[PDB]
Amino acid sequence: DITVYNGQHKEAATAVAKAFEQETGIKVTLNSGKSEQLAGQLKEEGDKTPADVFYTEQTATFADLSEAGLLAPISEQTIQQTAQKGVPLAPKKDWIALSGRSRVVVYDHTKLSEKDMEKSVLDYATPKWKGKIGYVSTSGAFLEQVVALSKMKGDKVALNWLKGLKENGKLYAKNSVALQAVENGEVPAALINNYYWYNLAKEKGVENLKSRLYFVRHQDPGALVSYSGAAVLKASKNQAEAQKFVDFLASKKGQEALVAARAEYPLRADVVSPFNLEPYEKLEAPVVSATTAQDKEHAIKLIEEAGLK
């Protein structure tokens, strides 16, 4: 039996855990919490941790653990299973990316069409969109978006974009509330993450939604994909089983379990999501370095500068 420090959505974690048991008979115990916290805890615990595996919604959390020397190597064959172009690879082969979540532009198709959409996420923060583009400043993925902007285009640009949002956009407290606002016709477009819409579409059927999604693509900063992944603790005293779970997560069957439970993009290229997501490769996601603590700190400041929050 193994213990998984889980920083991923409970349903996602539950679904893969169950499916693993069903296939192997090995029982999975989940310890759920926030990725950063768990990451902190693993460092503190060190060689004395109870965890065998760390399963997280953000692969960036692994850089630290890797450098601290806390992670075990994983099979190159397994790593290969999800190594599509643009997918981040652990330089030390001690973690693996499994699935992704994407920024998207959701819009009321009864009011806008694809011809009204912009070529870059940058263009939504302009006077053409005054009072017509919803955003969520307190969202974790918004912050990632800001990091990516600075990284890709510079702080000036990043800062200018936030400024444009303050002046022209409509602030919503949550992604779910922004999506509703679009659906209720309060605002015609919103910057959110893919999965909320896919969920709604499942629940209610596309035919009954006013909203549609628009993917910027072209390696635009607004085409940002955030990656989920896993790693085996070098302190694990249950290597074989722990490795087996990681291998399972990258297999067709583990990828199939995950996708049915959460609208994330599978990284294997032979798995089809039931939420009707497009293939990963069609997203044309930019390649951006992992976000660090300092990156986050830096983004918060820009946010602050712009009078946001």
Query: Binding site: residue ranges?
Result: 9, 57, 195-196
Tokens of 30: 């989940």
CA distance 66 to 54: 12
CA distance 191 to 297: 22
- The angle at the Cα of 10, spanning 5 to 14, to the nearest 5 degrees, equals 85
CA distance 299 to 157: 13
Q: Give the amino acid at 130.
A: K
Contacts of residue 205, defined as CB under 8 A and 6 or more positions apart, other chains included, come to: none
CA distance 220 to 152: 9
Experimental method: X-ray
Contacts of residue 241, defined as CB under 8 A and 6 or more positions apart, other chains included, come to: 1, 2, 26, 52
Where are the alpha helices (H) located in the chain, listed in sequence order? 10-24, 35-45, 62-67, 76-80, 140-153, 155-168, 175-183, 194-204, 239-250, 252-261, 293-305
| Residue-range domains of the chain with CATH | 1-101+226-277 (3.40.190.10), 102-225+278-309 (3.40.190.10)
Query: Binding site for Fe cation: residue ranges?
Result: 9, 57, 195-196
Could you count the other beta carbons within 10 Å of the beta carbon of residue 287? 11
Read out DSSP for 240-251? HHHHHHHHHHHS
